[PDB]
Amino acid sequence: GSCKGRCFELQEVGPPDCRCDNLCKSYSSCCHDFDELCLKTARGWECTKDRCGEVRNEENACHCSEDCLSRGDCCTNYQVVCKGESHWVDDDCEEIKVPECPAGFVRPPLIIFSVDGFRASYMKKGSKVMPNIEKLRSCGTHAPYMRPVYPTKTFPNLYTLATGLYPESHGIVGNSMYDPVFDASFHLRGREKFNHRWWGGQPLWITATKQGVRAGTFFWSVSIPHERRILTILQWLSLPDNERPSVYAFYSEQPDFSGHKYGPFGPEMTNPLREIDKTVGQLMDGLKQLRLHRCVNVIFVGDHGMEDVTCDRTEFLSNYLTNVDDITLVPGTLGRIRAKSINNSKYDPKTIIAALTCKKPDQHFKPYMKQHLPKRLHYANNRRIEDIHLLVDRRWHVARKPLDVSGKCFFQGDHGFDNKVNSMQTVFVGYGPTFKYRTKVPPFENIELYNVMCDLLGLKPAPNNGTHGSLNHLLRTNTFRPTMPDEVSRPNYPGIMYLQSEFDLGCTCDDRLHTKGSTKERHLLYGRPAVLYRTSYDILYHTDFESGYSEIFLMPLWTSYTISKQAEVSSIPEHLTNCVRPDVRVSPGFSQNCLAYKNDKQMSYGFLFPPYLSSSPEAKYDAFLVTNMVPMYPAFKRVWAYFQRVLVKKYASERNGVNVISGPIFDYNYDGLRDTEDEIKQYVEGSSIPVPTHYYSIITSCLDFTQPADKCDGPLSVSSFILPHRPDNDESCASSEDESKWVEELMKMHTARVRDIEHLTGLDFYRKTSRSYSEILTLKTYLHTYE
Numbered sequence: 001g002s003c004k005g006r007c008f009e010l011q012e013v014g015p016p017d018c019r020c021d022n023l024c025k026s027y028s029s030c031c032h033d034f035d036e037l038c039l040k041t042a043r044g045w046e047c048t049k050d051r052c053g054e055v056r057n058e059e060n061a062c063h064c065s066e067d068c069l070s071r072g073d074c075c076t077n078y079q080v081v082c083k084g085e086s087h088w089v090d091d092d093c094e095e096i097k098v099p100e101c102p103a104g105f106v107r108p109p110l111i112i113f114s115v116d117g118f119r120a121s122y123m124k125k126g127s128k129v130m131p132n133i134e135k136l137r138s139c140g141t142h143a144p145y146m147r148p149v150y151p152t153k154t155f156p157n158l159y160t161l162a163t164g165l166y167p168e169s170h171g172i173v174g175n176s177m178y179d180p181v182f183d184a185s186f187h188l189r190g191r192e193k194f195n196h197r198w199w200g201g202q203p204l205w206i207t208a209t210k211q212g213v214r215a216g217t218f219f220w221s222v223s224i225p226h227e228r229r230i231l232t233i234l235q236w237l238s239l240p241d242n243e244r245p246s247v248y249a250f251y252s253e254q255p256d257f258s259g260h261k262y263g264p265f266g267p268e269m270t271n272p273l274r275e276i277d278k279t280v281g282q283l284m285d286g287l288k289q290l291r292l293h294r295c296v297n298v299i300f301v302g303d304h305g306m307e308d309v310t311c312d313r314t315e316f317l318s319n320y321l322t323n324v325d326d327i328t329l330v331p332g333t334l335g336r337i338r339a340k341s342i343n344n345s346k347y348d349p350k351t352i353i354a355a356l357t358c359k360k361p362d363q364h365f366k367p368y369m370k371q372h373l374p375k376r377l378h379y380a381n382n383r384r385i386e387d388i389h390l391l392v393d394r395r396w397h398v399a400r401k402p403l404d405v406s407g408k409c410f411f412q413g414d415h416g417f418d419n420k421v422n423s424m425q426t427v428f429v430g431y432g433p434t435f436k437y438r439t440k441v442p443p444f445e446n447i448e449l450y451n452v453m454c455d456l457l458g459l460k461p462a463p464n465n466g467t468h469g470s471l472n473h474l475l476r477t478n479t480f481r482p483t484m485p486d487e488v489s490r491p492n493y494p495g496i497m498y499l500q501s502e503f504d505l506g507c508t509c510d511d512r513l514h515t516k517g518s519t520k521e522r523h524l525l526y527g528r529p530a531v532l533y534r535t536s537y538d539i540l541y542h543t544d545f546e547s548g549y550s551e552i553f554l555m556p557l558w559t560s561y562t563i564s565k566q567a568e569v570s571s572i573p574e575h576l577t578n579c580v581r582p583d584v585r586v587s588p589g590f591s592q593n594c595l596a597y598k599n600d601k602q603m604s605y606g607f608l609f610p611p612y613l614s615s616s617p618e619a620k621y622d623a624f625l626v627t628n629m630v631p632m633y634p635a636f637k638r639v640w641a642y643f644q645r646v647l648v649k650k651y652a653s654e655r656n657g658v659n660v661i662s663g664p665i666f667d668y669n670y671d672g673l674r675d676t677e678d679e680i681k682q683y684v685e686g687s688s689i690p691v692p693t694h695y696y697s698i699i700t701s702c703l704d705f706t707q708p709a710d711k712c713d714g715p716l717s718v719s720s721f722i723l724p725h726r727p728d729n730d731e732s733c734a735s736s737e738d739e740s741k742w743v744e745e746l747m748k749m750h751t752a753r754v755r756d757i758e759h760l761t762g763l764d765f766y767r768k769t770s771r772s773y774s775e776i777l778t779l780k781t782y783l784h785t786y787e
C-alpha cells in the first residue's frame, strides 16, 4: 500500500504488498510513494547555520531539528555546524583499547566500505586529497596493498570478499559468463544477474542471519545516491536492540568509472577520490553523532586496481585464426574462447591453441588450456570457465576482429589482468576496537577477509579458501585460535630387507650407507611434513636428503634437503649418466621399473634430490636410488635440470643457504586438490607408475639473511613454485635459446603459496619451528610475485 514509515525495511514481504526495501526498484515492485517518501532530496544533505533549531519538516532529505538525534535521522554534519562539534577527521587520533558502545549492543557492529577499482598507490596522494581515509589508514590496521582474485573484475572479487572463496568455487568467474547446463548468459547489464542459481558458497550476510546475527543490505538499488546510503545505515544503527543489525555494507562505483575514462595516473582522478573521502567523512561524522565512532568496526576495502590500457594497444585473433566467425570470445584484459554454436563439428581446441602459440615476436597474449593456467590463479574447476583461455599482458587488450574495437578512444584505463600485477593491487584498512592501533601488516589475499569479518561478528565461518588464523595479527582480540591438523598416516622406517639379487626391475648403473644422525637436524629444519590422508609411505634417510616414499604412487610425496652458502656444485659423472640403483629398504613390488621408461618413448625420468649438489662423490650414489626418481618428459627435464644445477645454488648464495622440499603433484581433474589413485588418467606406458601433472619446490631460508638457514632463531623467508609437467615448452616462446633466457621466467610465472601445495599434496609443512602457529599460517599464505 504505502511506505509511510517502512522506508528501506530489512524484512521480507511476500507478493503482493508493494515493498520499500533496497531491491524494490530492480524488480520494479516499489509503492507509488516510495520515491516521494524514502528518496527525499529537499535542502541537500548538509545542515546550514540558519537551519539549526528548526521545527520538523517531513519533506526534508535529512533533519536539522532538536529531536533528530532522538529520532535518529539528522544530517551527518548536524552537530558540527549547530552544536559546535568537530569533524571526526579534525579530532586527534586516540587508541580504542575497548569498544565504547551504548547499553543493549551485544557485539560491536561491522561497516564494510567497498570501493570499486581502488588502486593501492592512490593512498600515496595522502591527506591532501583524502584526509578522512588517511586517518583510518594511519590510526587503524592497514596493508601496503591487498591481492584480489583472478580475473581482477568487480563481480568475482566483491563476491570473493563476501564468501572467502575463489571465483571457480563461488561460481562468479567474470562480469560476463555463459553456463552450459542453464543455457543462459550472466552479464553486468541484465535481469539474469539477480537470479540466485548463479551465486554459490555462503556470503557473510547469509552466514550471519543463519547464526542469529541480523544483517543490513549489501546491495543498493542503482538509483539511490551515496549520501542516502550513509543516512540509511546510520538510521538502521538507531533502531532498537531486537531489530538493529550488526553487519552493514556500503559500495561505491568510483573511482573505477573515472579510472576507465581518464586512466590511473590522471589529474581528473583527484575529485573522484575527494568524493569518496567526503562519503567516508559523512559516515564517520554520522557515527560520532550516534556515539558509535569508537564502537563500530570499519573496513575500507577495494575489489581491484587499474592499469593504463588504450584502444591502440589491442591484439586481434583475426591475425592468427583464419575463421573468426566460428568462435565466441570474452574480450578485453582477459580472453575466454568457445564455439559460437554447438552445431559446428570442425571446432578443434588443439588447432586454435597451436594457431595462437608464439606466432609474433612481440605477442601481448599467451593461450592456455585452463588446466595449464598457473595454479596460483585457481581458475579452472567450473563449467562457466571456457577450456581455451588467454592471459593478456598488462596495458593491452584482445578482441575477435578490428571492427569490434571504436572511435578515437573512449577508455584510457581497464582491469582484469593477472592478480599479481602491481596495477591490479587494491587497498585494505581496518579501523575500530577489534583492529590494532597504528599497525602496518604485510600484503594478503582478499580470500582471507571472510574469516576475519566472521571473527569481528563472532560467527562460525563457512568452509572457505581462507587460512583461518593467518590474519590473527590484524586483530587486537582473537575469537579463533588455530590448531595443527592430526596426522592420519603414521610413517614407516624400513631397514635392509630385500637383496640386490631379488630386484628384477630391468635396470643398470655401471659402478653406514642409509642412516640418521645429521639427516633430521640439517635436512628437516622445520620438522617432518605430516600426511593428512590414509596411505602407506616410508621415511628414507640419506647423508644429503630425506624423503617420504609412497608405496601406492611408487615415488616420494616429499624430498627435503639443505644447501649452505659455501656448498659445492659438481657435474653428473658420464659413467653414472643412466645409473638407477634399487633401494634394499623397499620391496621390488612397491618400486618403479626402469624397463617402463624404455618402452615409453615420450617419458624419460629425473631425480627430486639433485646429484649435482651431492656432499661427496660417495654421497652422489644415494641420488641415483630408484626411490628418488620420478617420471619426467625430456621437455620438462630442461626446466628441472637448470633449476637443480644452477638456481638451487644461486638461491643458497644470495639467501645465505636454503632448505628445499621438492615432490610431485597429481591434479588431472584440476580442482586444486590432491588426486586419489582412481582420478589419475595417465600412467607410464605398460606400468602402474602414475605421471605427476606438476612438480612443487618449497625453498625456505632465514628472513635475517646474516644468519644461515640452519641456526635461524628469527623469522623465516619462503619462496615456492608449482611447475606444470608439460611434454613441450610451447608456454615459453624463447625455449629455443639457452635455459638461462626462459626457464627462470616460467618459474616466476608459476610461483605459488605453501597452502596451494598442501591442498595439492595433502601434506602439512613447518610443524617443528620456533614460531607461533598463526605466524606460520601467514608464512604459508605468502606469495613471491617478483614485481
Ligand SMILES: CCc1nc2c(C)cc(N3CCN(CC(=O)N4CC(O)C4)CC3)cn2c1N(C)c1nc(-c2ccc(F)cc2)c(C#N)s1
Pocket (backbone or CB within 6 Å): 112, 114, 154, 155, 158, 159, 161, 162, 193, 194, 195, 196, 199, 200, 203, 206, 217, 218, 219, 220, 249, 250, 251
Ligand atoms: C556490481 C555490483 C553488484 N551488483 C549486484 C547485483 C545486481 C546483484 C547482486 N546479488 C548477489 C546476491 N544474490 C542474492 C543473495 O542474497 N544470494 C544468492 C546467494 O545464495 C545469496 C543476488 C543479488 C550483487 N551485486 C553486486 N555485488 C557483487 C555487490 N557487492 C556487494 C558486496 C560484497 C562484499 C562486501 F564486503 C561488500 C559488498 C554487494 C552485495 N550484496 S553489491
Ligand SMILES: *[C@@H]1O[C@H](CO)[C@@H](O)[C@H](O)[C@H]1NC(C)=O
Pocket (backbone or CB within 6 Å): 165, 166, 169, 378, 463, 464, 465, 671, 672, 673, 759
Ligand atoms: C575452496 O573452498 C571450497 C569450499 O570449502 C572447496 O570445495 C574447494 O576445494 C576449496 N579450494 C581449494 C583449492 O582448496
Ligand SMILES: [Ca+2]
Pocket (backbone or CB within 6 Å): 666, 667, 668, 669, 670, 671, 672, 673, 674, 675, 679
Ligand atoms: Ca585433483
Ligand code: NA
Pocket (backbone or CB within 6 Å): 729, 730, 732, 733, 735, 736
Ligand atoms: Na618451443
Ligand SMILES: [Zn+2]
Pocket (backbone or CB within 6 Å): 116, 117, 153, 154, 155, 256, 303, 304
Ligand atoms: Zn570493479
Ligand SMILES: [Zn+2]
Pocket (backbone or CB within 6 Å): 117, 154, 256, 257, 260, 415
Ligand atoms: Zn571497471
